[PDB]
Structures are given as C-alpha cells and as structure tokens.
C-alpha cells in the first residue's frame, strides 16, 4: 500500500502506525488462451492470502 501511495505521489513517513480494515492482499490467477490478441478480455480468479475474513464487495486494483 505504501508503494502504491508513493507511486501516486504521496509519501507516508516510515515507522508510523497504520492499521487498515478495508484492504486485503490477494493472488490473481488467469488462463492465457490460444491465439490471444492484445486488447481482448479474460476471466480471473482472486484468492486471499493472509488472515482476511471475506472479499464480499471488494474491488481489484
């Protein structure tokens, strides 16, 4: 999250308190199809990877 914020233009000081609740770290997996052309779309699977309770209404960045 700090990497993303820094990339966007906001530098959070280091060694500071930060406890979020609406964010989860996920692994995304997909299947590259045959003869795939750039611009097309595929379906992805999103899976939690640490101590999260649910991904009910989330959005993948």
């Amino acid at each position: 999250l700090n990497n993303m914020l820094s990339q966007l233009g906001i530098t959070v000081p280091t060694g500071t308190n930060m406890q979020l609740k609406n964010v989860a770290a996920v692994m995304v997996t997909a299947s590259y199809p045959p003869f795939a052309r750039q611009g097309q779309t595929i379906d992805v699977v999103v899976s939690s990877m640490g101590n999260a309770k649910s991904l009910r209404g989330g959005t993948l960045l």
């Binding site: 820094s6 990339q7 966007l8 233009g9 906001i10 530098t11 959070v12 000081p13």
Partner: protein, 211 residues
C-alpha cells in the same frame, strides 16, 4: 584596513515600493481581479515535490563516514648449545683431554613489523537547493549555495547532486545520503581562513624533505 570601501554581501536596494493596483473596470461587479499570472495544473492531494526547473527543495546534510585498517607480523628464534667434559678418565684422555671437545654456542633472531591507517568525516546542517535540470527518467539535478558573513569574513556552503523524486519526504526534504553525485563544499575567506594555510616554505618542506 577598515576605511577601504568594500561592497556588502547583500547588494542593491534592500527595500521595495508597493505599486498601486489597476483601476477597476465599471461592470456590475465588486470583485476585481488584477491580471493573474496563470500557472499550470497543480494537484490537490499530492505532496509538494519539485517538478520543474526553478523549484526549491530542502537537503538535510547528515554525513558520517569512518574507515580503518591495521596489521602486524613478527618472528623469533633462539638457540643455545653446550657440552663440557669436566673430569676425563685416563683411557679417554686421547679424545677429550685438554678441553679439546668442549663447546658452547648461542644464537638469536627477532623481527617485529606493524602498521595501520584510518580516516573519518562528519557533516551536519540544512540547506535549500534549486532544481536546474530534469533528467530523462524523472530525476532532478539540484544545485545550491548559502553565503554567510559574521562580522569579519565570509563562509560558503555549496551543494550539487542528483535526486530521485520518490525519496522526497512529505515536508519537501531529502537526507543528503540519498543524493547520487553528492558534491558538498564548506569553505571560507578572510584572514581567519588565511591563518589556516601552511606557509610556502613549510609546504615545500612537507613534500621535499627526506624525512
């Protein structure tokens, strides 16, 4: 001397006169805006980082380097041999008589070498520099100079380097250990500085003396 005219460090006029604003145009409005110099798009939530030529940026000089080395070696050797026939029996007098076989010898050797070296330096302060070029990958070349004159002489603190924008903190400041081609300089003039150069004769001897 103190009567020889010298120019001050801060030259020119040290005051400015306010200029009267323009006469308001007689539309139906009370709000009158003097000609506003339009500056470009400015983000709202992003930190104030320098982005173009001429922007300022604070450097926090904190340098602390310290290196050292040493070594040694040694060696030693002793030896001491002896032999003495005090009372020789008669039947042996033809071989060990008249002290013809007594012997005594000694020997020694020693060596000790050693050496070492070290170096160190520190630096602490704060200095605001200015961007003078934007590189092809977003890095900023920065240069800066601060001149002080406390009652007798003049000290100069100059700085130059290259900064990566993603290292600038939220308060528009970078520690000097994150600058790539750091050139720092802290010099002075006046007789206080002249009292710290070696005399030409001593400087010559320091280089050409045999020892």
């Amino acid at each position: 001397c103190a009567w020889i005219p010298a120019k001050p460090l801060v030259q020119g006029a040290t005051t400015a006169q306010p200029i009267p604003g323009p006469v308001p145009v007689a539309n139906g409005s009370i709000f009158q805006s003097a000609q506003p110099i339009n500056y470009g798009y400015q983000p709202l939530f992003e930190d104030r980082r320098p982005r173009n030529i001429g922007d300022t940026l604070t450097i926090v000089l904190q340098e602390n380097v310290s290196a050292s080395k040493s070594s040694s070696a040694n060696a030693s050797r002793d030896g001491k041999t002896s032999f003495g026939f005090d009372t020789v029996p008669r039947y042996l007098q033809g071989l060990f008589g008249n002290s013809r076989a007594d012997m005594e010898a000694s020997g020694g050797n020693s060596f000790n070498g050693k050496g070492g070296a070290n170096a160190s330096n520190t630096f602490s302060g704060t200095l605001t520099v200015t961007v003078d070029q934007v590189l092809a990958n977003g890095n900023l070349h920065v240069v800066g100079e601060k001149q002080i004159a406390i009652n007798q002489g003049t000290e100069f603190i100059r700085f130059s380097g290259v900064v990566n924008p993603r290292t600038i903190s939220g308060s528009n400041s970078v520690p000097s250990t994150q600058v790539a081609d750091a050139r720092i300089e802290y010099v002075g003039n006046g007789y206080i500085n002249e009292a710290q150069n070696m005399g030409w004769l001593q400087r010559f001897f320091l280089n050409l003396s045999p020892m």
